Amino acid sequence: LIGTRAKYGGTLKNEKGRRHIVVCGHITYESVSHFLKDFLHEDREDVDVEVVFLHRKPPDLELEGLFKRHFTTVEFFQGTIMNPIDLQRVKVHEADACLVLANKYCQDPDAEDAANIMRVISIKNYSDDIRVIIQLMQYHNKAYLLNIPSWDWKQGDDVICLAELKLG
């Protein structure tokens, strides 16, 4: 019993002149893979930005293989973006931007949007001058993000509304 221990955890490794982003929210195979195809694309001109994934549940076998193929630029950490301790582990203040992904296959889009918005509040509470980009299910939930005092569109914060963009 003593020998067995968890494999995911620990503070993110620090590097000199290291630029990285934190991705939280819905972490699945066909959602992370599409983002990694464009962010780490073959033809993109040479800029090195690490990708940090912070999900509460450990990755499954389908997604574990994806992280193996991108071991040099993608690292996974088990935790919650809402926990201030886990925010320190992923080094939020060192991150260039924070990305929040939305669960497209959700029974209640309003409940998913509220949880996603509340994640932004936790990130903004930890660090005021952090750039946050969020996927939002419904257009009418954009007004809630405007209620956050630290949310500034000119600073770099932006909202990607799936319903508005897809049907647009």
Residues that bind another protein (CB under 8 A): 21, 35, 38-39, 56, 80, 82-84, 87, 97, 99, 111, 114-115, 117-118, 121-122, 125-126, 133, 140, 142-144, 146-150, 156, 158, 160, 164-165, 168
For residues 24 and 54, the answer to whether their CB atoms sit within 8 Å is yes
Phi, psi angles (nearest 5°) of residue 131: -90, 125
Q: Which is nearer to another protein, 66 or 160 (CB)?
A: 160
In whole angstroms, the minimum distance from the beta carbon of 144 to another protein comes to 6
Q: Which is nearer to another protein, 5 or 41 (CB)?
A: 41
CA 72: distance to chain centroid? 18
Q: Which residues lie across from 99 on neighbouring strands?
A: 23, 133
Q: Among candidates 68, 78, 69, 55, which has minimal Cα distance to 7?
A: 78
For another protein, which is the closer residue by CB, 69 or 140? 140
Q: Least distance (Å) from another protein to the CB of residue 125?
A: 6
> Is the CB of 12 or the CB of 81 nearer to another protein?
81
Residue 104 DSSP symbol: S
Give the list of residues 6+ apart from residue 143 with CB closer than 8 angstroms, or none.
none
Residue with smaller CB distance to another protein, 1 or 112: 112
Reported as type and span, the H/E element at residue 160 is strand 158-161
Least separation, in Å, of the C-beta of 50 and another protein?
13
Q: How far is the CB of 1 from another protein (least distance, A)?
A: 26
Cβ-contact 50, 124 below 8 angstroms? no
Closest approach of Cβ 118 to another protein, in Å?
A: 5
